[PDB]
Design a protein around this ligand. Structure first.
Ligand SMILES: CCCCCCC/C=C\CCCCCC(=O)OC[C@@H](O)CO
Ligand SMILES: CCCCCCC/C=C\CCCCCC(=O)OC[C@@H](O)CO
Ligand SMILES: CCCCCCC/C=C\CCCCCC(=O)OC[C@@H](O)CO
Ligand SMILES: CCCCCCC/C=C\CCCCCC(=O)OC[C@@H](O)CO
Ligand code: NA
Ligand code: NA
Ligand SMILES: [Zn+2]
Lengths: 88, 83, 108
């Protein structure tokens, strides 16, 4: 789970790109990790609310999962744009 | 909806394009995370318990900083672009 | 709904960790403005530290929700805070890595 992201970081450290590109490649996947952690925190909050009050939290989990997906899409796009301009 | 507006009018060099798009997409991400927190706080039945207005303020603040960051990003880049 | 400016001030007043990170952000932004770097590099130096503030605000929002329930420890409450704190940590690590790579490539 943190392997897949750290693996990308290693690749981004190996690719013959300039410093700016490397930062963008690395930061985009670290953002995915950040949003995944925040989403899992929200999921824990939802579960905590359910445990305490026996109440659902509406679309809280769906909204958090959508945040992760967008972060992932942002990462794919970033990598595509950069690594296609770098060579295509 | 005005995000996809920003994206298509960003579509300049590749690196700059990534920065313009990403700054706006970060706003989307943060807004979704803020909306998730809101869905918990304002859930059905929340009126019967202790309610964290603080949580919603903090989440809205995160959106504000994301937006401000996006403005600073576009301003610096576009000022570099023209003039 | 939430009040953003009210929220910013509340985070500052109530969270010592937010003030600590906030002053670090201000220092970095001032340095970023002072440094002789191109626009792209400047944007990255600034956005990377600003992300810490964004994530800390979200983390603090998460914390406020579970704390509102009660003071007594619950495993799910601890889990939520740990995950939120890990997110902030990764944002900070990312910021330092960004600064290290960009500054060293430009000036090293
Ligand atoms: C000094 C600002 C730090 C720079 C980073 C960007 C913004 C992050 C946080 C700013 C909100 C702080 C506002 C609250 C404040 O300082 O009021 C004064 C308070 O300390 C005394 O009662
Ligand atoms: C270039 C700066 C000069 C002008 C300063 C104007 C701003 C005045 C007050 C701003 C807020 C002070 C923040 C200090 C603070 O709370 O730090 C403590 C924190 O790091 C420890 O937990
Ligand atoms: C809290 C401040 C700590 C500063 C430590 C000492 C740093 C001295 C020089 C910085 C490294 C080289 C950067 C060069 C540079 O961008 O110059 C700035 C610009 O104003 C000149 O054209
Ligand atoms: C190419 C890599 C360059 C890296 C430069 C050296 C990095 C050394 C330390 C990195 C971590 C920075 C500080 C992280 C930290 O302790 O966070 C503080 C805590 O408040 C987090 O929640
Ligand atoms: Na990032
Ligand atoms: Na940005
Ligand atoms: Zn706290």
């Amino acid at each position: 789970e943190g392997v897949a992201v750290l693996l990308c970081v290693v690749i981004a450290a190996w690719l013959d790109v300039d410093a700016v590109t490397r930062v963008l490649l690395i930061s985009s996947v670290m953002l995915v990790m950040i949003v995944e952690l925040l989403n899992s925190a929200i999921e824990a909050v939802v579960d905590r609310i359910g445990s305490e009050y026996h109440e659902l939290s509406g679309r809280a989990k769906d909204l958090g999962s959508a945040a992760v997906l967008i972060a992932i899409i942002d990462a794919v796009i970033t990598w595509a744009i950069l690594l296609w301009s770098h060579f295509g």
